[PDB]
Ligand binder design. Structure first.
Ligand SMILES: Nc1ccn([C@H]2C[C@H](O)[C@@H](COP(=O)(O)NP(=O)(O)OP(=O)(O)O)O2)c(=O)n1
Ligand SMILES: [Mg+2]
Ligand SMILES: [Mg+2]
Length: 427
DNA sequence: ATATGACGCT
DNA sequence: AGCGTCAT
């Protein structure tokens, strides 16, 4: 066993991100139950982000604003900007950039969503460990850090607990030895406190972090103490932590695979996987998955933090649910044009900022009926950032999908259009 | 009826 | 190349 204690990895995720972006801009919304919403026309718009004050009333994502007002009569709402007849997320992308640029200053980051990134702090920890000369680590360096699983053994409020675990941890801490993994996580954590102070100081956004030995544990830990707090999950904390951790809560196990592990194995919790041999697990779920479950239920995972702060694709989509589905060749050309146009603006920007060009265009459509996300995908060359050309070509490579013998109509009505630029390349 | 992005498998 | 899974 290489006790997967070779790296220090952190995941930083912003608290109710879209809400914070709106609240920084409109101070009236601060410290109040509020949500960000998309498309006012239908039931007040669907909710995409909720403040913690509003979560306390039960408001969630996937909820009509109308319905959320019932749980929470005083809920304030901000709408997503809308442009060319669709949601426009530029404000959130720009806020995201602010945050990525700051984290990038500390370390090598992997952009994992619009509001989170992974950081590999192995080197910064090592470096910081040479320049602190065996000087102890004070609790005052860790003003927002929880140590998962402490306190234990021999104040009933939350900050009281926080501190006692932190004190126990630190008093435990094995400081004259620099190869200690726990000490490294600690130093990593001091670093992420700094990171997190820089982010708030420079953008006014609060976030949470997890600090551990790998991406999966870091991500899990991030959630344990949201909002505005960070959590160190040490290797030794894993058996107790996983012993009642529902399987679905681990990254990549929230879907069918996780369900099949539960069903086939007849278990509920991560820790229960330890009782199987790697071979048994590979027989059930394949070589890479068995291997991966066998390691992961023991807290070990080697997926690296990828040095990638820029998306691999840029894309645009719109659903036409139910009656609104597109059923004329005019509707299809016109929305393709609407989408091509945003994509053109986002591409030109991208090229200026990041010295690269996309080279392939991916057209996706959904049809009325077909089960889920995409029904059909077709590719063509992306050679000019021209919305009219991208539109034209996108149509070209999907027109044959139209079963309508009549020239004007489109059948079946399309319930989704998606354009995506991909295959980027230095420029 | 609530816009996006990464990546594996064939 | 085109489809399927998993995620925010
Ligand atoms: N299904 C989803 C999930 C998130 N998002 C957007 C809005 C979120 O504010 C933002 C960040 O995602 P998120 O981390 O899952 N949630 P959020 O940051 O809002 O709240 P917490 O992380 O504090 O729980 O992505 C979305 O548009 N659709
Ligand atoms: Mg978040
Ligand atoms: Mg997130």
């Amino acid at each position: 066993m290489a006790t997967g204690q070779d790296r220090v990895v952190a995941l930083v995720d912003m608290d109710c991100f879209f809400v914070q972006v709106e609240q920084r801009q409109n101070p009236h919304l601060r410290n109040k139950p509020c949500a960000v919403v998309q498309y006012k026309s239908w039931k007040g718009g669907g909710i995409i982000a909720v403040s913690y004050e509003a979560r306390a009333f039960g408001v969630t994502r996937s909820m009509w604003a109308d319905d959320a007002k019932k749980l929470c009569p005083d809920l304030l709402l901000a709408q997503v900007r809308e442009s060319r007849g669709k949601a426009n997320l530029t404000k959130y992308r720009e806020a995201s950039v602010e945050v990525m640029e700051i984290m990038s200053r500390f370390a090598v980051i992997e952009r994992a969503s619009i509001d989170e990134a992974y950081v590999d702090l192995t080197s910064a920890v090592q470096e910081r460990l040479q320049k602190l000369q065996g000087q102890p680590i004070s609790a005052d360096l860790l003003p927002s850090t929880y140590i998962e699983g402490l306190p234990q053994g021999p104040t009933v409020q939350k900050e009281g607990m926080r501190k006692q675990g932190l004190f126990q941890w630190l008093d435990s801490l094995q400081i004259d030895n620099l190869t200690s993994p726990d000490l490294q996580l600690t130093v990593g954590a001091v670093i992420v406190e700094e990171m997190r102070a820089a982010i708030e100081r420079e953008t006014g956004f609060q976030c949470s972090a997890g600090i551990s030995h790998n991406k999966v544990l870091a991500k899990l830990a991030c959630g344990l103490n949201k909002p505005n707090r960070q959590t160190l999950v040490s290797h030794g904390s894993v058996p107790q932590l996983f012993s009642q951790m529902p399987i679905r809560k681990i990254r990549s196990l929230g879907g069918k695979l996780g369900a099949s592990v539960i069903e086939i194995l007849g278990i509920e919790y991560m820790g229960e996987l330890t009782q199987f041999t790697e071979s048994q697990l590979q027989s059930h779920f394949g070589e890479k998955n068995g291997s991966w479950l066998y390691a992961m239920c023991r807290g070990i995972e080697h997926d690296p933090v990828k040095p990638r702060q820029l998306p691999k694709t840029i894309g645009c989509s719109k659903n036409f649910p139910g009656k609104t589905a597109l059923a004329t060749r005019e509707q299809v050309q016109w929305w393709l044009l609407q989408l091509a146009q945003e994509l053109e603006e986002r591409l030109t920007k991208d090229r200026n900022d990041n010295d690269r060009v996309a080279t392939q265009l991916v057209v996706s459509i959904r049809v009325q009926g077909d089960k889920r996300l995409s029904s059909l995908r077709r590719c063509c060359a992306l050679t000019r950032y021209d919305a009219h050309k991208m539109s034209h070509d996108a149509f070209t490579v999907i027109k044959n999908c139209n079963t309508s013998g009549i020239q004007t109509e489109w059948s079946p009505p399309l319930t989704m259009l998606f354009l995506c630029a991909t295959k980027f390349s230095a420029s």
